[PDB]
Amino acid sequence: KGSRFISTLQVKLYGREGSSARTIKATLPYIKQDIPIVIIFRALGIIPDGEILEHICYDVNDWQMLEMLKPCVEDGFVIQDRETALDFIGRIQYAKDILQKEFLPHITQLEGFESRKAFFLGYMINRLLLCALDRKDQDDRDHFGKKRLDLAGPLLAQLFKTLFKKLTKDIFRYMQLAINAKTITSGLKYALATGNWGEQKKASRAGVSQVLNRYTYSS
Amino acid sequence: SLMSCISVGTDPMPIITFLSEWGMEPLEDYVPHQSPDATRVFVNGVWHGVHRNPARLMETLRTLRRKGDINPEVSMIRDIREKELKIFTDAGRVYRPL
């Protein structure tokens, strides 16, 4: 309701069946390597390896779930407190910004919510394991309830927002009302007239504004 | 198809408040080591809180939109077999009447 945000999050269980190196790591927006699921947990604020396991395990009797959680604790046992965690993400405090901002922002990007960011993270490592122990058939990427579709509104919403985009950075040039007015009109015009959905003049989901069909009222 | 329609976009704030006033515990004061039968609430992919007995929750709500207090396009669901409750004020859902 305020952007597009193309920064996705990956959390993967390494080591297939028979490999005892089943370390769980996580790739995050704007960060090179995959960070062990413990280092990110302490950069959050949850410190003791053992206190993080309630965020993952919602019933400390799934002894076979906690057995895969062994090495990832030792994989990130070298870092112990919150400070050391986010330096390995690299004055070098800049990791706290990326964690607070471009990371699980469908929760809020304000700091003080460090507990929902962890209890959601553990819930993800949770659901990841149920498929590893075949207590869940992996989700259906071809399931239709999981699919949404943008009609005229949200399509115009992306275009109107991405049009107003560099309109306000063009009024920032009126200092160094007599502002630009054609750009909002000729942009809405272009995308709805070409089918290549706008994006300045570089095409991008071409074939979305099709001309209507008038052979039979049914058609 | 004919009788199909598409969601339009509802606001989530006047219902996440209706949760906190009917048995929702936010997850800052939540540790599962005293409540495992903790059912999980979800609104558009956001885990806001926890409830205990969803029996009279998911049915006081299922009769709350049926009278008009909540928007009819917002979809309920509780997965009993997995103890979860997701709610979608989303924009893009393809709802049929029945």
Binding site: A152, G153, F160 | -
Partner: peptide, 24 residues
């Protein structure tokens, strides 16, 4: 989709200060 765009979600994109917007 268009009515709910023009009515509400069109105003939401106003963030020398922008206020309520009217369309003829």
């Amino acid at each position: 989709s268009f009515n709910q765009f023009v009515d509400y979600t069109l105003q939401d994109i106003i963030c020398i200060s922008f206020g309520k917007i009217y369309v003829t």
